[PDB]
Every structure is written in structure tokens, then in C-alpha cells.
């Protein structure tokens, strides 16, 4: 994984000192320094003419170097391209696939990727629309017992649980070509507006625990498949979600973290990860809040 503790890992009290010394304005200025980082990588596949319409946004390409490639394609429309990047996590390579909100013409590509990448958990942090702006397609069967066929992948909705800030859908993916079935847990977090932060850092961290528990529960019933994490572009809330997850993973296990290093490295894998200085400052603030709440400081 690129997410090694070194070289300036910080303990949770050094983090308190750090945030206290920089303040919100300093953390905002730190975010801008990450954006300045020389964008290593290229975006050619994203901009190939056969692929333009497979991007939801003109200004959110994805990196050639880390993109998820589609293997078992069918149809001249299905290239090997999907706007989705492998992302390392704490002590794990390809912990996540950060992807955009699937478009109608990429629903089939999305499920192909989920299938091929052995994905067990999907985290969605977007509503379908926001401000009447379309933000993500309805790429899964929404009602219990309904099914959609995406070529040789039939997805069936096995049940939905509605909770506080998220709904948990259990999907069966049926590869009807290889007669293989796999359960996939789809999580949709509903209280995270685009370009913004969640209303409760505590709800996001509890949701993160729910997702980790689900990923852990699914992996024990099968090296570890990535978690698909998408928002609308799959960079703003996605990068924030994933950075927070890595930082809490390193904090839990090593007693250290480094937000800067985490987001800097994440943006070499899912380009443009973390979209606003507000979301950047939220990683710091949620971690400190988790740490107070836990009596670590």
C-alpha cells in the first residue's frame, strides 16, 4: 500500500497540537497545498472519444494508472473503461474502488466491475438528485424482490433496512453465464450533501463502523476485495470517506495518523480526492471528535 505510516506519522495528541496551531484557516491552506501537488499520471482513457460519455462530469476524469479495467465486455459500447480507480487503504492494496455515480449507459459497466473485482460491499454517499440536479443513476433494483439484468449479471434486491442516516440493501448478483451467485451489501448514506460535510461526524463514523463490520463479515464468509465507494463524481465525499477510514484504521492499529500524507497519496490514486477545504478540515475535525468522544485527549 502507498499508505505507510512513515514518514511523519502523528499521535492523537500531536494531532491536537497540530490542529490547534494551524486552526481552520491553516487547515484550509493545507488543503490548497495538496491541490498544488504535481498531478502525476495521465487521463487519456477517460478522454478517449469512446469514453467521454462514460464520465458523468467533464471535469472529473480518472487516472489511467489506477483505473479499474473491464475484462469481460460485450457490445461495441462497452470499452474496458469505467470511471473508477483502485485506491490503497491502511496496510492494504486496493482497499477501495472510488467510482462515480453510475450513469444509465454505465450501469452495466458498474456491475461488471463489481462482479470482476469480487466486490462485496458498495458504499454510496449521494442522493439520486440534489437541487434537482441529477447526481447518480438508479443503478440497482430498488424494491425488494425486483431484479435488473445487466447482460450476464442479474442483480436482485433481497431486502432493504432503513436506518438513521443510511439504508442497507442486500443484493444478490447472479452471473448467469457461470451460474455463480454472490451477495453484495449496498449501503446508501443519505445525510452527506455534495460539496459539503455530513451533519454529524458521529453518524459518519458509526456508518463507517457498520461498513467495516459488513466488509469483515462478508470476507469471513469466503486477497480482501475492495469496497466500492462512490458519490456523484466519486471524488469529494468518496475521498473524504476513504481518507477518514484510512486515518482511523492507522489510528486504531498504530496509534498514529497523518491526514496530509493520506490525502496526498490518495490523490495519486483517485485523482481530485477530497473536493473542498471544508471536507479536508472535516477529516481532522471528525478524528479529533472521535478522539474526544473516546477519551483519547
Amino acid at each position: 500500500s502507498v499508505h505507510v505510516p512513515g514518514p511523519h506519522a502523528m499521535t492523537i495528541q500531536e494531532l491536537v497540537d497540530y490542529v490547534n496551531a494551524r486552526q481552520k484557516q491553516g487547515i484550509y491552506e493545507e488543503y490548497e497545498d495538496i491541490r498544488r501537488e504535481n498531478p502525476v499520471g495521465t487521463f487519456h482513457c477517460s478522454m478517449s472519444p469512446g469514453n467521454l460519455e462514460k464520465n458523468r462530469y467533464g471535469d472529473v476524469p480518472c487516472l489511467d494508472q489506477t483505473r479499474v479495467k473491464l475484462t469481460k465486455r460485450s457490445g461495441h459500447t462497452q470499452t474496458d473503461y469505467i470511471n473508477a480507480s483502485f485506491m490503497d487503504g491502511y496496510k492494504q492494496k486496493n482497499a477501495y474502488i472510488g467510482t462515480q455515480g453510475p450513469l444509465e449507459n454505465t450501469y452495466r459497466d458498474f456491475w461488471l466491475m463489481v462482479w470482476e473485482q469480487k466486490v462485496l460491499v458498495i458504499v454510496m454517499t449521494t442522493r439520486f438528485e440534489e437541487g434537482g440536479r441529477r447526481k447518480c443513476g438508479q443503478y440497482w433494483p430498488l424494491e425488494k424482490d425486483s431484479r435488473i439484468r445487466f447482460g450476464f449479471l442479474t442483480v436482485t434486491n433481497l431486502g432493504v433496512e432503513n436506518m438513521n442516516h443510511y439504508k442497507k440493501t442486500t443484493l444478490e448478483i447472479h452471473n448467469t453465464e457461470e451460474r455463480q451467485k454472490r451477495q453484495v451489501t449496498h449501503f446508501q448514506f443519505l445525510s452527506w450533501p455534495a460539496y459539503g460535510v455530513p451533519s454529524s461526524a458521529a453518524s459518519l463514523i458509526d456508518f463507517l463502523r457498520v461498513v467495516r463490520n459488513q466488509q469483515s463479515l462478508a470476507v469471513s464468509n469466503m486477497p480482501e476485495p475492495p469496497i466500492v465507494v462512490h458519490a456523484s463524481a466519486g471524488i469529494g465525499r468518496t475521498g473524504t470517506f476513504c481518507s477518514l477510514d484510512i486515518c482511523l484504521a492507522q489510528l486504531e492499529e498504530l496509534g498514529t495518523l497523518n491526514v496530509f500524507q493520506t490525502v496526498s497519496r490518495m490523490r495519486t490514486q483517485r485523482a481530485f480526492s477530497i473536493q473542498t477545504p471544508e471536507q479536508y478540515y472535516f477529516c481532522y475535525k471528525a478524528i479529533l471528535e472521535f478522539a474526544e468522544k473516546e477519551g483519547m485527549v
Binding site: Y57, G58, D59, V60, Y195, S232, I235, Q275
Partner: peptide, 7 residues
């Protein structure tokens, strides 16, 4: 077209 940034 559709832009993500600049709101």
C-alpha cells in the same frame, strides 16, 4: 457538458 466543481 456537466461540471462537478465551481458548484
Amino acid at each position: 457538458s456537466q461540471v462537478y466543481s465551481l458548484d
